[PDB]
């Protein structure tokens, strides 16, 4: 009977081990390690390691992998004790943060020096987690690869299939000023909606096929980006973006849905813009006050 | 014709401006500012600013963002001069964006621009310190803009993934489970067809990158469907063509036939080609109804 251990490192690895326990994976001992003692406390695993207990003190490592690496080096002997006797160790972690990125290679090294067949299985971050977290993941992937027998890499980008966020907020307003279309707004109109207004609200929604206007305008008004708060606003800008075949009536039908949701006496400017859309119509809103 | 400028600050802001330039956004001047001289150089923006080249000396900020921006005030004023509207784009929580954005917004608004902040705030998995640094940065930026559009990265994840935050990584958690269980069921859970640990060791010891694919199929041709989906699975980093060893796990319900399992193994063998050393086993999963799942781990390139 082979002795098999899975050690999940950092938050992603801790949640993956939770999923394995919950799905009844048999034949395996589970261990979780983290610099954050909070995640560790709600773990379903009965083998719990707080990394860097004397230095990070269970408070978490933050963003820098160097802290997670130093944390695991400090806990080397307790990691060896938990893994002792394994024929095979899986090191599970999400690349991109301070703990999994930096601690996973140290734990793999200790498992393999103990004599275990050591397999890393990791994720890499969404591109829209940004360059710092993706760059860290690249470096941690290579360091882990040095210390595992085999390395399995699962891309969160690809797992998607099976962001333009800041771009879309900007274009929402600027296409209506600088790119002539069916309906546009003067710069002075934007300025009155947005001068000295404080917090503004962004929503978005898309709708394919006929009556795509009703569908897209309804998704926009309850977009999670709005956080369920659109009604009452004193002013609001509405962008209706679509393809070549975009009737001014479809635009008016979309804006109608939203004027109802806003309220009474709401200054609602709006306009259009054409994009590269098979009956697919996108509605964005920004509302203030 | 109004003069509109976007100034992207730090990594998230530099990223945003690249996306706008690549998408061909029209009628807007773009500017990028970062303490990191390297990320700037690669940028596709005509107007570049290395913030605080004396304080940071071209090294990223990791309070350092704010000081870098103050020291660069002249270059910021000069790039923004003449704007009717300035979008100050940044991701809150980092070392550059969080400190620099409110200074850049202050300069832009004192020059006379309608100044709109548009910012992300962090994923909760980025941690409490990151998230509290972002809140400070947000409340400081809000003092110096006309209006502030705030995009929570947690909500962006829901919008992109289509799933509540609690379940945003359920599928990734589940794939990591299946990667493990692909092997461990075959070693440790008794079935018609198990594998010896020594033979797993042959496939996986001192190998480097192991490719992983999964596919599910149903109905009459479920084996053809499941196996082919596994060998062109988007999870695969590269083609399995040419691998020197592979483990195949065939999992099914109580109606799965020897022929079904044999067809799936044969499909993977032909797709890899050559003299690949293939080992395989089976597992039962009774939650499956006229379905089978094929997973492959290939090594050796
Ligand atoms: N599978 C899984 N991946 C996650 C989860 N949360 C975040 N991630 C991904 O894993 C990466 C690392 O996050 P985390 O493990 O929480 O970082 P750390 O604990 O600070 O090292 C993130 O960049 C996300 O891409 C999760 O709950 N499950
Ligand atoms: N949605 C999105 N968020 C990002 C992106 N890049 C960074 N962020 C967020 O912005 C925060 C600051 O990251 P970053 O700008 O690279 O740090 P800085 O350059 O040192 O200020 C990160 O914690 C992420 O939450 C991106 O491309 N898309």
């Amino acid at each position: 009977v082979a002795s098999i251990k899975v050690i999940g490192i950092g938050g992603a690895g801790n949640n993956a081990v939770n999923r394995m326990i919950e799905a009844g994976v048999q034949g395996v001992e589970f261990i979780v390690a983290n610099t954050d003692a909070q995640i560790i406390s709600v773990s379903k695993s009965k083998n719990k390691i707080v990394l860097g207990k004397e230095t990070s003190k269970g408070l978490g490592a933050g963003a820098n992998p160097d802290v997670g690496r130093q944390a695991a080096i400090e806990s080397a002997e307790e990691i060896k004790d938990a893994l002792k006797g394994a024929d095979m160790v899986f090191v599970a972690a999400g690349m991109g943060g301070g703990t999994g990125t930096g601690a996973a290679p140290i734990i793999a090294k200790l498992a393999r020096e103990q004599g275990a067949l050591t397999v890393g299985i990791i994720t890499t971050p969404f591109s829209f987690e940004g360059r710092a977290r993706n760059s860290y993941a690249i470096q941690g992937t290579e360091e882990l690869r040095k210390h595992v027998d085999s390395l399995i890499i699962i891309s969160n980008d690809r797992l998607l299939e099976v962001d333009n966020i800041l771009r879309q907020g900007v274009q929402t307003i600027t296409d209506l000023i600088a790119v002539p279309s069916l309906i546009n707004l003067d710069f002075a109109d934007i300025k009155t909606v947005m001068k000295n207004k404080g917090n503004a609200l962004f929503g978005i929604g898309i709708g394919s096929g006929k009556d795509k206007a009703i569908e897209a305008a309804n998704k926009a008004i309850i977009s999670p980006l709005l956080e369920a708060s659109i009604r009452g606003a004193r002013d609001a800008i509405i962008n209706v973006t679509g393809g070549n075949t975009l009737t001014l009536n479809d635009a008016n039908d979309a804006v109608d849905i939203v004027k109802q949701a806003i309220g009474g006496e709401v200054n609602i400017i709006f306009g259009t813009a054409v994009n590269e859309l098979d009956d697919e119509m996108i509605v964005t809103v920004i509302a203030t006050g």
Side-chain angles (χ1 to χ4, degrees), chain A residues 1-130 132-134 136-161 163-164 166-207 209 213 215-230 232-233 235-240 242-243 249 251-252 254-255 257-258 261 263-264 266-268 270-273 281-289:
Chain A
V1 182
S3 170
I4 307 180
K5 300 189 179 186
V6 176
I7 181 166
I9 300 161
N14 300 157
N15 284 327
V17 166
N18 279 346
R19 169 64 182 143
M20 294 166 210
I21 291 171
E22 174 188 31
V25 173
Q26 310 161 69
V28 177
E29 278 184 59
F30 307 101
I31 305 162
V32 295
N34 202 324
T35 58
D36 182 298
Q38 146 49 24
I39 311 285
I40 285 305
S41 53
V42 302
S43 176
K44 295 177 193 291
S45 159
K46 72 189 182 67
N47 309 294
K48 303 187 180 189
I49 304 176
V50 183
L51 306 165
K53 288 185 311 206
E54 289 204 313
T55 299
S56 287
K57 293 187 174 76
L59 297 161
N64 181 27
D66 298 3
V67 179
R69 170 175 194 275
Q70 194 54 225
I73 297 170
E74 291 169 31
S75 313
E77 294 295 325
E78 167 172 17
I79 293 159
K80 294 199 253 170
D81 290 358
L83 298 179
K84 181 166 181 58
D87 302 300
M88 188 170 203
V89 179
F90 296 81
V91 177
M95 295 289 101
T99 296
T101 307
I106 294 288
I107 285 162
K109 167 209 190 76
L110 302 166
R112 188 186 35 71
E113 291 182 337
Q114 265 183 328
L117 177 65
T118 301
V119 180
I121 177 162
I122 63 172
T123 62
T124 55
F126 290 111
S127 49
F128 56 92
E129 299 183 38
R133 293 180 67 84
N134 276 273
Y136 280 146
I138 287 168
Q139 298 169 27
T141 295
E142 181 48 51
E143 271 299 302
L144 184 58
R145 195 184 176 271
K146 161 183 322 163
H147 286 295
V148 294
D149 287 302
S150 301
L151 178 56
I152 298 179
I153 303 178
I154 288 140
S155 162
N156 273 120
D157 293 330
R158 304 294 71 87
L159 184 70
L160 203 40
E161 311 173 10
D163 80 305
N164 302 262
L166 310 184
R167 186 201 93 194
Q168 290 162 316
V170 176
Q171 216 162 331
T172 294
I173 294 174
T174 72
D175 269 355
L176 282 43
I177 299 175
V179 190
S181 185
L182 283 299
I183 314 162
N184 286 97
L185 307 166
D186 299 322
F187 171 72
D189 292 322
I190 300 305
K191 175 173 166 210
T192 72
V193 177
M194 300 197 81
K195 192 181 66 67
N196 302 124
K197 298 298 183 183
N199 299 297
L201 303 165
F202 180 84
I204 187 169
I206 58 178
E215 178 198 346
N218 190 31
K219 282 185 177 175
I221 68 188
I222 56 191
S223 185
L225 303 179
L226 287 167
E227 284 164 28
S229 52
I230 178 180
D235 306 297
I237 305 176
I238 291 172
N239 177 313
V240 184
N249 308 88
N252 253 1
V255 184
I257 304 172
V258 178
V266 50
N267 178 24
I268 284 189
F270 62 84
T272 70
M281 163 176 292
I282 305 170
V283 173
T284 45
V285 54
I286 291 175
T288 75

